[PDB]
Amino acid sequence: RELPFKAKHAYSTISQLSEAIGPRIAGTAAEKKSALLIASSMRKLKLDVKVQRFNIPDRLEGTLSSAGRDILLQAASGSAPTEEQGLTAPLYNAGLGYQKDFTADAKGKIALISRGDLTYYEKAKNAEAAGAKAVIIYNNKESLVPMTPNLSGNKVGIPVVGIKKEDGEALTQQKEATLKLKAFTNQTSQNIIGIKKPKNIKHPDIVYVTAHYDSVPFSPGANDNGSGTSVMLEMARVLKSVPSDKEIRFIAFGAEELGLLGSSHYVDHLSEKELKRSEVNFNLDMVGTSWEKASELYVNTLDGQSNYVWESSRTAAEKIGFDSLSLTQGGSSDHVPFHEAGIDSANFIWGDPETEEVEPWYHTPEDSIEHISKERLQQAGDLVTAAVYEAVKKEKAKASDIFEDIK
Ligand SMILES: [Zn+2]
Ligand SMILES: [Zn+2]
């Protein structure tokens, strides 16, 4: 029947998350404020809401200087802090960070490594095995912000930081640098779970509609992923008055940008009973960009194969007349823990129909509401709402499929 998804509602939610709150870094007060907002919104929708808390890694922050130049940095989660006075050591130019690039001269020095070829972890691991005191990785691409040198969930015993291209290029000419990094401990995040349960069905099939509500540092996260969070909530509003024998769980996942930490926690804590009842996960991540080229709505499965999510989406696209739906392979969002547990899942995201690429604003301060399209929210919202309606109406992954920006 009629499913009045309204993108204006989603836009309003994106404004609340990305403008009134701003960047929602995992573990920070902004993410906790966002969780309160999402929980409050779900309760308005007649949902049974719980907040599920979980520990996340220490958060590293600090500064870097050399020859009087202060350099903005982003510290890698899972690397070491410094003493409060900071770590001062000579710089060692290690090129791209292959094993061959570390001579005996590297021991006791801060390894300066250009991004490229190798993963950030491989670079940091090669430097540490070579006796480096710390690792500075500088971007090989221009960017508004220093790159995060994501370590693919590994732990490194020395500091690892990422800096901008022009800063690293200057650093290749300097003798030494000082790094000051503090670890903030006791970090926690949370998931917000709102359940629409059928009143007199015993052990119903479970359908998950999910989106992560955290963003990367310095990004307002309007599209990644205020958009998916907002479309998930508006779909919950639409489906509130839809009878169903399925148990529908709408979930806002925390700490996705650190490696799917919230969805991994959530799926890990499902009982075996719930896993057997688990039917399908529709994950929404980046569904509102205004970027003109991102005209194709992709359905990403971890193996690129069809599953129940694709079937329902294919059917929905036919019912609403939408011809720019494509099935493709992709991980690195919260559908992945569901897939690993054997539950049909997929991630919905707009992409360049030529190449699948996303907007240039991704993971930058320009991931802002200025670059959100209500028409894209509306079309994505109408498609996934119809797909979930089709599903509910009555009658281990490799590191590069888990993490984002690992090289
Ligand atoms: Zn995302
Ligand atoms: Zn992201």
Short mmCIF file of all heavy atoms in Angstrom, two decimals, residues 64 73-76 79-80 87 91-92 94 96-97 102 109-114 119-129 131-138 147 149 151 156-163 171 179 181:
data_model
loop_
_atom_site.label_atom_id
_atom_site.label_comp_id
_atom_site.label_asym_id
_atom_site.label_seq_id
_atom_site.Cartn_x
_atom_site.Cartn_y
_atom_site.Cartn_z
N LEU A 64 52.53 17.61 16.79
CA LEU A 64 53.81 17.29 16.18
C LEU A 64 54.44 18.59 15.75
O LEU A 64 53.75 19.47 15.22
CB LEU A 64 53.62 16.34 14.99
CG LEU A 64 54.77 16.18 14.00
CD1 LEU A 64 55.92 15.43 14.64
CD2 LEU A 64 54.32 15.46 12.72
N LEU A 73 47.95 16.47 12.91
CA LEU A 73 48.11 15.03 12.78
C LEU A 73 46.81 14.33 13.14
O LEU A 73 45.93 14.90 13.81
CB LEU A 73 49.25 14.50 13.67
CG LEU A 73 49.06 14.54 15.19
CD1 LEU A 73 48.34 13.29 15.73
CD2 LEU A 73 50.41 14.66 15.88
N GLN A 74 46.70 13.09 12.70
CA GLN A 74 45.67 12.17 13.19
C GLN A 74 46.39 10.91 13.63
O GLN A 74 47.12 10.31 12.84
CB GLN A 74 44.63 11.86 12.12
CG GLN A 74 43.51 12.87 12.07
CD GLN A 74 42.35 12.45 12.94
OE1 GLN A 74 41.54 11.61 12.54
NE2 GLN A 74 42.28 12.99 14.15
N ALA A 75 46.18 10.53 14.89
CA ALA A 75 46.87 9.39 15.45
C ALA A 75 46.10 8.11 15.15
O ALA A 75 44.87 8.11 15.11
CB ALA A 75 47.05 9.55 16.96
N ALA A 76 46.84 7.03 14.92
CA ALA A 76 46.22 5.76 14.58
C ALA A 76 45.70 5.08 15.84
O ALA A 76 46.45 4.89 16.81
CB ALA A 76 47.21 4.86 13.86
N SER A 79 47.79 2.55 18.40
CA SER A 79 49.22 2.82 18.50
C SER A 79 49.53 3.43 19.86
O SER A 79 48.63 3.67 20.68
CB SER A 79 49.69 3.72 17.35
OG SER A 79 49.11 5.01 17.40
N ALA A 80 50.83 3.68 20.13
CA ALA A 80 51.25 4.07 21.46
C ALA A 80 51.25 5.59 21.63
O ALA A 80 51.52 6.33 20.67
CB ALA A 80 52.64 3.53 21.76
N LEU A 87 58.00 12.86 22.65
CA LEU A 87 59.07 12.06 22.07
C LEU A 87 59.81 12.89 21.02
O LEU A 87 59.24 13.25 19.99
CB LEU A 87 58.50 10.79 21.44
CG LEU A 87 59.44 10.05 20.49
CD1 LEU A 87 60.58 9.46 21.27
CD2 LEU A 87 58.69 8.98 19.71
N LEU A 91 64.74 12.29 12.53
CA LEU A 91 63.86 11.76 11.49
C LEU A 91 64.64 10.83 10.56
O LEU A 91 65.80 11.11 10.22
CB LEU A 91 63.24 12.90 10.69
CG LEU A 91 62.18 13.72 11.43
CD1 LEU A 91 62.04 15.08 10.78
CD2 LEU A 91 60.85 12.98 11.42
N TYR A 92 64.01 9.73 10.15
CA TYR A 92 64.61 8.81 9.20
C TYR A 92 63.67 8.68 8.00
O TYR A 92 62.53 8.24 8.16
CB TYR A 92 64.86 7.43 9.83
CG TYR A 92 65.33 6.39 8.83
CD1 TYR A 92 66.68 6.25 8.53
CD2 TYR A 92 64.42 5.56 8.18
CE1 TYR A 92 67.11 5.30 7.61
CE2 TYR A 92 64.85 4.62 7.26
CZ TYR A 92 66.19 4.50 6.98
OH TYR A 92 66.61 3.56 6.07
N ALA A 94 62.11 6.92 5.13
CA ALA A 94 61.95 5.51 4.79
C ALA A 94 61.18 5.29 3.50
O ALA A 94 60.78 4.15 3.23
CB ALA A 94 61.27 4.77 5.94
N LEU A 96 58.56 4.48 1.00
CA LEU A 96 57.25 3.86 1.15
C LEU A 96 57.17 2.86 2.31
O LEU A 96 56.08 2.37 2.61
CB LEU A 96 56.85 3.15 -0.15
CG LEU A 96 56.68 4.11 -1.33
CD1 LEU A 96 56.53 3.34 -2.64
CD2 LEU A 96 55.47 5.01 -1.08
N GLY A 97 58.28 2.55 2.96
CA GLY A 97 58.22 1.72 4.15
C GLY A 97 58.37 0.23 3.93
O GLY A 97 57.99 -0.54 4.81
N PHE A 102 64.55 0.29 5.36
CA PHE A 102 64.99 0.55 6.72
C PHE A 102 66.40 0.01 6.88
O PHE A 102 66.60 -1.20 6.99
CB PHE A 102 64.04 -0.07 7.73
CG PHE A 102 62.68 0.56 7.75
CD1 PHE A 102 61.63 -0.01 7.07
CD2 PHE A 102 62.47 1.74 8.44
CE1 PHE A 102 60.38 0.59 7.08
CE2 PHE A 102 61.22 2.34 8.45
CZ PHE A 102 60.18 1.76 7.77
N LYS A 109 65.04 6.25 15.63
CA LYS A 109 64.61 7.45 14.91
C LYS A 109 63.12 7.38 14.61
O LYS A 109 62.51 6.31 14.65
CB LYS A 109 65.41 7.63 13.62
CG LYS A 109 66.91 7.73 13.86
CD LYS A 109 67.64 8.24 12.64
CE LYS A 109 69.14 8.42 12.92
NZ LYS A 109 69.80 7.13 13.29
N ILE A 110 62.52 8.54 14.33
CA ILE A 110 61.13 8.56 13.90
C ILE A 110 61.11 8.31 12.40
O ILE A 110 61.67 9.09 11.63
CB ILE A 110 60.44 9.88 14.25
CG1 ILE A 110 60.51 10.14 15.75
CG2 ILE A 110 58.98 9.86 13.79
CD1 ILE A 110 60.23 11.59 16.15
N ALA A 111 60.45 7.23 11.99
CA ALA A 111 60.37 6.86 10.58
C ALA A 111 59.35 7.74 9.88
O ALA A 111 58.19 7.80 10.29
CB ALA A 111 60.00 5.39 10.43
N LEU A 112 59.78 8.42 8.83
CA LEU A 112 58.91 9.24 8.01
C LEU A 112 58.64 8.48 6.71
O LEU A 112 59.57 8.23 5.93
CB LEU A 112 59.54 10.61 7.74
CG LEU A 112 58.76 11.59 6.87
CD1 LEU A 112 57.46 12.03 7.53
CD2 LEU A 112 59.65 12.80 6.59
N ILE A 113 57.39 8.10 6.50
CA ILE A 113 56.99 7.18 5.44
C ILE A 113 55.94 7.86 4.59
O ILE A 113 54.95 8.38 5.11
CB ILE A 113 56.44 5.86 6.02
CG1 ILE A 113 57.40 5.31 7.09
CG2 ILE A 113 56.21 4.84 4.91
CD1 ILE A 113 56.91 4.02 7.73
N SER A 114 56.13 7.83 3.28
CA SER A 114 55.08 8.29 2.39
C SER A 114 53.99 7.24 2.31
O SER A 114 54.26 6.04 2.34
CB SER A 114 55.62 8.58 1.00
OG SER A 114 54.56 8.82 0.09
N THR A 119 49.90 -1.24 2.99
CA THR A 119 48.97 -0.78 4.01
C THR A 119 49.71 0.00 5.09
O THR A 119 50.92 -0.12 5.28
CB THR A 119 48.22 -1.96 4.64
OG1 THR A 119 49.14 -2.77 5.38
CG2 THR A 119 47.54 -2.79 3.57
N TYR A 120 48.95 0.83 5.82
CA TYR A 120 49.53 1.59 6.91
C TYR A 120 50.11 0.67 7.97
O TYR A 120 51.17 0.95 8.54
CB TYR A 120 48.49 2.51 7.53
CG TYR A 120 47.94 3.53 6.58
CD1 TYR A 120 46.58 3.75 6.49
CD2 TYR A 120 48.79 4.29 5.78
CE1 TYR A 120 46.07 4.70 5.62
CE2 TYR A 120 48.29 5.24 4.92
CZ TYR A 120 46.93 5.45 4.85
OH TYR A 120 46.42 6.40 3.98
N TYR A 121 49.42 -0.43 8.26
CA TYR A 121 49.94 -1.38 9.24
C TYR A 121 51.28 -1.94 8.80
O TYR A 121 52.23 -1.99 9.59
CB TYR A 121 48.94 -2.52 9.48
CG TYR A 121 49.54 -3.56 10.39
CD1 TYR A 121 49.91 -3.23 11.69
CD2 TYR A 121 49.79 -4.85 9.94
CE1 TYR A 121 50.49 -4.16 12.52
CE2 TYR A 121 50.37 -5.80 10.77
CZ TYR A 121 50.71 -5.45 12.06
OH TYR A 121 51.29 -6.37 12.91
N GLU A 122 51.39 -2.35 7.53
CA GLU A 122 52.64 -2.91 7.02
C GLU A 122 53.78 -1.91 7.17
O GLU A 122 54.90 -2.27 7.56
CB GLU A 122 52.49 -3.33 5.56
CG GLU A 122 52.04 -4.79 5.38
CD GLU A 122 51.20 -5.00 4.12
OE1 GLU A 122 51.31 -4.19 3.17
OE2 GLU A 122 50.43 -5.99 4.08
N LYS A 123 53.51 -0.64 6.86
CA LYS A 123 54.53 0.39 7.02
C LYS A 123 54.94 0.51 8.49
O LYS A 123 56.13 0.51 8.81
CB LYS A 123 54.01 1.74 6.50
CG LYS A 123 53.65 1.74 5.02
CD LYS A 123 52.89 3.01 4.67
CE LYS A 123 52.46 3.01 3.20
NZ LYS A 123 53.59 3.26 2.26
N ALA A 124 53.95 0.61 9.39
CA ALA A 124 54.26 0.79 10.80
C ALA A 124 54.97 -0.43 11.37
O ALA A 124 55.88 -0.30 12.19
CB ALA A 124 52.99 1.08 11.60
N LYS A 125 54.54 -1.63 10.96
CA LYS A 125 55.18 -2.85 11.44
C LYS A 125 56.62 -2.94 10.96
O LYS A 125 57.51 -3.34 11.72
CB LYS A 125 54.36 -4.05 10.99
CG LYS A 125 55.03 -5.39 11.18
CD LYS A 125 54.20 -6.50 10.52
CE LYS A 125 54.01 -6.25 9.03
NZ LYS A 125 53.98 -7.52 8.25
N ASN A 126 56.88 -2.58 9.70
CA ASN A 126 58.26 -2.59 9.20
C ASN A 126 59.11 -1.59 9.97
O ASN A 126 60.26 -1.89 10.32
CB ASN A 126 58.30 -2.27 7.71
CG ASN A 126 57.75 -3.40 6.86
OD1 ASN A 126 57.63 -4.53 7.32
ND2 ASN A 126 57.43 -3.09 5.61
N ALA A 127 58.57 -0.41 10.25
CA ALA A 127 59.34 0.58 10.99
C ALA A 127 59.63 0.10 12.41
O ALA A 127 60.75 0.25 12.90
CB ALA A 127 58.59 1.92 11.01
N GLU A 128 58.64 -0.49 13.08
CA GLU A 128 58.85 -0.91 14.46
C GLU A 128 59.87 -2.04 14.54
O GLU A 128 60.75 -2.04 15.41
CB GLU A 128 57.53 -1.32 15.11
CG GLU A 128 57.70 -1.99 16.46
CD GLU A 128 56.42 -2.02 17.29
OE1 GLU A 128 55.33 -2.20 16.71
OE2 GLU A 128 56.52 -1.87 18.52
N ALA A 129 59.77 -3.01 13.62
CA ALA A 129 60.75 -4.09 13.59
C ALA A 129 62.15 -3.56 13.29
O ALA A 129 63.14 -4.17 13.69
CB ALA A 129 60.35 -5.14 12.55
N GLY A 131 63.29 -0.90 14.60
CA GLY A 131 63.73 -0.15 15.76
C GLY A 131 63.30 1.30 15.79
O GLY A 131 63.84 2.07 16.60
N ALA A 132 62.38 1.71 14.93
CA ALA A 132 61.90 3.09 14.94
C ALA A 132 61.24 3.41 16.28
O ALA A 132 60.65 2.54 16.93
CB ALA A 132 60.90 3.33 13.81
N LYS A 133 61.37 4.67 16.70
CA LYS A 133 60.73 5.14 17.92
C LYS A 133 59.29 5.57 17.69
O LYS A 133 58.51 5.61 18.65
CB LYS A 133 61.51 6.32 18.51
CG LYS A 133 62.67 5.91 19.42
CD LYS A 133 63.03 7.04 20.36
CE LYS A 133 64.34 6.78 21.09
NZ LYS A 133 64.29 5.50 21.86
N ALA A 134 58.93 5.89 16.45
CA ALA A 134 57.59 6.34 16.08
C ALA A 134 57.54 6.33 14.56
O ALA A 134 58.57 6.22 13.88
CB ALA A 134 57.27 7.73 16.62
N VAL A 135 56.32 6.45 14.03
CA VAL A 135 56.05 6.44 12.60
C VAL A 135 55.20 7.65 12.28
O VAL A 135 54.17 7.87 12.92
CB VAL A 135 55.33 5.15 12.16
CG1 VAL A 135 55.06 5.17 10.66
CG2 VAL A 135 56.12 3.92 12.54
N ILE A 136 55.65 8.44 11.32
CA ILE A 136 54.84 9.51 10.73
C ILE A 136 54.60 9.12 9.27
O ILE A 136 55.56 8.97 8.50
CB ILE A 136 55.54 10.87 10.84
CG1 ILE A 136 55.88 11.18 12.30
CG2 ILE A 136 54.69 11.96 10.20
CD1 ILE A 136 56.73 12.43 12.49
N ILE A 137 53.35 8.93 8.90
CA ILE A 137 52.97 8.61 7.53
C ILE A 137 52.33 9.85 6.94
O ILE A 137 51.41 10.41 7.54
CB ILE A 137 52.03 7.40 7.46
CG1 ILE A 137 52.66 6.20 8.16
CG2 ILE A 137 51.71 7.08 6.01
CD1 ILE A 137 51.77 4.96 8.25
N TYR A 138 52.82 10.31 5.80
CA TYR A 138 52.25 11.50 5.18
C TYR A 138 51.53 11.14 3.88
O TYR A 138 51.97 10.26 3.13
CB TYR A 138 53.30 12.59 4.93
CG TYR A 138 54.42 12.26 3.99
CD1 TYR A 138 54.38 12.67 2.67
CD2 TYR A 138 55.57 11.61 4.45
CE1 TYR A 138 55.44 12.41 1.80
CE2 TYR A 138 56.63 11.34 3.58
CZ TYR A 138 56.56 11.74 2.27
OH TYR A 138 57.60 11.49 1.40
N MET A 147 45.59 12.65 7.02
CA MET A 147 45.04 11.31 6.86
C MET A 147 45.14 10.52 8.16
O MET A 147 46.10 10.67 8.92
CB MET A 147 45.80 10.57 5.75
CG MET A 147 47.31 10.82 5.81
SD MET A 147 48.40 9.40 5.47
CE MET A 147 48.02 8.32 6.84
N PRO A 149 46.07 7.11 9.72
CA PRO A 149 46.81 5.89 9.31
C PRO A 149 46.25 4.62 9.96
O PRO A 149 46.89 4.00 10.82
CB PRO A 149 48.24 6.20 9.75
CG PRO A 149 48.07 7.07 10.95
CD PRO A 149 46.81 7.89 10.73
N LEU A 151 45.26 1.17 11.22
CA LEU A 151 46.13 0.01 11.37
C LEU A 151 45.40 -1.32 11.21
O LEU A 151 45.93 -2.36 11.64
CB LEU A 151 46.83 0.07 12.74
CG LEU A 151 47.79 1.26 12.87
CD1 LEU A 151 48.30 1.39 14.30
CD2 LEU A 151 48.97 1.09 11.91
N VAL A 156 50.16 -1.56 17.47
CA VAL A 156 51.56 -1.22 17.24
C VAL A 156 52.10 -0.60 18.52
O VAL A 156 51.40 0.16 19.20
CB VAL A 156 51.72 -0.27 16.03
CG1 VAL A 156 53.17 0.12 15.83
CG2 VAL A 156 51.19 -0.94 14.77
N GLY A 157 53.33 -0.96 18.87
CA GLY A 157 53.94 -0.57 20.13
C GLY A 157 54.62 0.77 20.15
O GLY A 157 55.15 1.17 21.19
N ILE A 158 54.62 1.48 19.03
CA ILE A 158 55.18 2.83 18.96
C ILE A 158 54.09 3.76 18.46
O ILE A 158 53.06 3.30 17.93
CB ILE A 158 56.45 2.87 18.08
CG1 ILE A 158 56.17 2.32 16.68
CG2 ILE A 158 57.57 2.08 18.73
CD1 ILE A 158 57.36 2.43 15.74
N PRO A 159 54.25 5.07 18.63
CA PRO A 159 53.26 6.01 18.07
C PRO A 159 53.22 5.92 16.55
O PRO A 159 54.25 5.72 15.90
CB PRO A 159 53.77 7.38 18.53
CG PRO A 159 54.65 7.10 19.71
CD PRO A 159 55.26 5.75 19.46
N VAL A 160 52.01 6.04 16.00
CA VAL A 160 51.79 6.09 14.56
C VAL A 160 50.83 7.24 14.27
O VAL A 160 49.70 7.25 14.78
CB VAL A 160 51.20 4.77 14.01
CG1 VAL A 160 51.04 4.86 12.50
CG2 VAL A 160 52.06 3.55 14.42
N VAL A 161 51.26 8.21 13.46
CA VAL A 161 50.42 9.36 13.14
C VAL A 161 50.44 9.60 11.64
O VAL A 161 51.39 9.24 10.94
CB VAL A 161 50.84 10.65 13.89
CG1 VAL A 161 50.91 10.42 15.41
CG2 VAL A 161 52.16 11.21 13.34
N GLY A 162 49.37 10.21 11.15
CA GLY A 162 49.27 10.58 9.75
C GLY A 162 49.21 12.09 9.63
O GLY A 162 48.62 12.76 10.47
N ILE A 163 49.86 12.63 8.60
CA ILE A 163 49.91 14.07 8.38
C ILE A 163 49.67 14.35 6.90
O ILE A 163 49.69 13.44 6.06
CB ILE A 163 51.24 14.69 8.84
CG1 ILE A 163 52.39 14.17 7.96
CG2 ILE A 163 51.49 14.39 10.32
CD1 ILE A 163 53.74 14.81 8.28
N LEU A 171 58.91 17.82 6.04
CA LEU A 171 59.60 17.02 7.06
C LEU A 171 60.75 16.21 6.48
O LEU A 171 61.69 15.90 7.21
CB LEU A 171 58.63 16.07 7.74
CG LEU A 171 57.84 16.56 8.93
CD1 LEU A 171 57.30 15.34 9.67
CD2 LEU A 171 58.72 17.45 9.81
N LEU A 179 56.99 14.58 18.97
CA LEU A 179 55.61 14.12 18.98
C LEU A 179 55.10 14.10 20.41
O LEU A 179 55.78 13.60 21.31
CB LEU A 179 55.54 12.73 18.34
CG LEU A 179 54.25 12.22 17.74
CD1 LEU A 179 53.93 12.97 16.48
CD2 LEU A 179 54.46 10.75 17.43
N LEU A 181 51.66 12.84 22.31
CA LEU A 181 50.42 12.10 22.12
C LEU A 181 49.93 11.57 23.45
O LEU A 181 50.69 10.92 24.18
CB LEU A 181 50.59 10.94 21.14
CG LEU A 181 50.91 11.28 19.68
CD1 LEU A 181 51.40 10.03 18.99
CD2 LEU A 181 49.70 11.86 18.97
#
